[PDB]
A = this chain, B = another copy of it.
Amino acid sequence: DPNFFKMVEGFFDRGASIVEDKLVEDLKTRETEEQKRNRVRSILRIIKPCNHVLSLSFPIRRDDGSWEVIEGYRAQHSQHRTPCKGGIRYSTDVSVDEVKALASLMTYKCAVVDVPFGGAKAGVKINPKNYTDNELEKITRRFTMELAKKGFIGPGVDVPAPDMSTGEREMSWIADTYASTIGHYDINAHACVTGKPISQGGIHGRISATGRGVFHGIENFINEASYMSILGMTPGFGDKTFVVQGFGNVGLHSMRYLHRFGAKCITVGESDGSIWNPDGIDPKELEDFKLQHGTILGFPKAKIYEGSILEVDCDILIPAASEKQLTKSNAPRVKAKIIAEGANGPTTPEADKIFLERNIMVIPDLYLNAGGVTVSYFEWLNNLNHVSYGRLTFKYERDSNYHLLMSVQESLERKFGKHGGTIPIVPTAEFQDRISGASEKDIVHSGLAYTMERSARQIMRTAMKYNLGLDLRTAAYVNAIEKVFRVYNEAGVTFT
């Protein structure tokens, strides 16, 4: 059991040395050779720490007439690209030594996916259960004023986001406090947060983003014939099983999309039980079960099978569980060729060194868990463009499709249809749903699939350039460190 901060700090040095050896050669600057080395050994010392760490204190008054002091935090990691997106975590285990880590984790998690803005995290030392709803907006509406008066919230500086125990309703209390106190004169005032409900500028298909994230991530590696061979699996999802730990937003929506392309959910683990049916599980039925029941423990159509789900015989683990969930105590007992981290840092840094020995491809959490980080970038743009995606072009592009089909029809009917007949060129029953059911949802899920795809093909490229084999995690950080470097380097890092 390590300290999560030393993990993310570890994967930097682990990656910093690799990239450096070629990152120096790629400098056509008019200096010596040992001053290039002392420029690359040096910027990396600047990317590693956290540039800003605020620390707050709130006069909040409970509804029973009892004042109290709330302690908060927020750490902007990198200023190289503004704004800086990062969720707000209401908890009690919040630590300034942890906010600095998850802030750094996002500077790179949104660099591997070519999302512009940097990384940040906030954290409020409150246990949400102990507060009435009138008291979680007195806290939220003042954690922003105190934080926006100091340039840590704003469409061009920081963009808070949801987190576990910080839902859709939280993000309205932030966007309304900002768009009425400080951001009033700013036209983009509602772009100060993401995850807002749809009635206030949220994007559609957001709650299924990390799901689509976890999906397209592993999709681009299952369909990689140059990796399935090395592992021992075949390309494609066909006749492959997956297992899910931590049923929830990331697990549930992942189950759906994987089960839609022939995969078979075998087990579903949670904090308080375990499920198993080697014939598979129906996501919707199990999704429906937890609605009334609140806990899948006792699912009818699948027997109970307790134990370490990380031992489950399968092909694909997907841990949506807590951080540091898979460690040496059970790493030699995976029974899965591919691990797909759905949460932040499930794999302790030792298991990765084990997994390259067991010949396991561990897809990192920088890449898979990007997910919402990308739609939370498409929602920032939605609010920053003041129009839903596609409203201007759904029907202009609908007409362009009917005319092509007509143009292909009439063109044939000159050659073949001369006999008075006709060729009713019509869209399929599928490309008809795509037309009649067009929505902003279809464009979000599209630009998300493109981001994951174009990015995975950049992790692969590095895993050959530097010959990392199945060490995709290291490959991910080398792309993250290399692209954050090209922003400091060509910018005259210091403003002097």
Contacts and interface: CB of A to CB of B under 8 A. Distances in A.
Please give the count of copies of this chain that the complex contains: 3
A231 interface: no
A54 B52 contact: yes
B392 A407 contact: no
A6 interface: no
Contacts of A173: 492
Contacts of A42: 61, 66-68
22 contacts: A29-B133, A35-B65, A42-B67, A45-B68, A49-B57, A49-B69, A59-B493, A82-B179, A141-B495, A145-B181, A145-B495, A149-B151, A176-B491, A182-B182, A199-B489, A393-B443, A395-B446, A395-B447, A405-B408, A405-B411, A407-B425, A415-B423
B57 A392 contact: no
A395 B449 contact: yes
A273 B252 CA distance: 68
Contacts of A61: 42, 493-494, 496
A225 interface: no
Interface of A: 29-30, 35, 38-39, 42-43, 45-46, 49-57, 59-61, 65-69, 82, 114, 116, 133, 137-138, 141-142, 145-146, 149-152, 155-156, 169, 172-173, 176-177, 179-182, 184-189, 197, 199-200, 378, 380-381, 384-389, 391-397, 399-401, 403-408, 410-412, 415, 423-428, 430-431, 434, 442-443, 446-447, 449-451, 453, 483, 486-496
A412 B422 CA distance: 11
Contact of A403 (B141, B412, B434): B434
Contact of A169 (B180, B185, B490): B490
A57 to B, nearest CB: 5
Contacts of A67: 38-39, 42-43, 45-46, 493-494
Contact of A53 (B55, B141, B451): B55
A401 B399 contact: no
Contacts of A189: 82, 156
B186 A156 contact: yes
Contact of A404 (B146, B394, B404): B404
Nearest 9 CB-CB pairings of A with B: A42-B67, A156-B187, A396-B446, A403-B431, A181-B181, A53-B55, A395-B450, A392-B447, A199-B486
Contacts of A400: 397, 401, 434
Nearest to A403: B431
Contacts of A151: 149-151
Given A49-B69, A394-B450, A395-B453, 9 more contacts: A138-B494, A141-B495, A181-B182, A200-B490, A399-B434, A401-B404, A404-B431, A406-B431, A408-B425
A410 B428 contact: yes
B46 A69 contact: yes
Contact of A494 (B60, B395, B483): B60
Of the candidates A54, A399, A430, A491, the one having the most CB atoms from chain B within 10 angstroms of its own CB is A491
A336 to B, nearest CB: 30
Nearest to A453: B395
Given A186-B156, A396-B443, A403-B431, A57 B68 contact: no
B431 A407 contact: yes
B38 A66 contact: yes
Contacts of A53: 54-55
Given A404-B404, A427-B403, A387 B381 contact: yes
Nearest to A40: B67
A376 to B, nearest CB: 13
A157 B54 CA distance: 16
A113 to B, nearest CB: 11
Contacts of A401: 400, 404
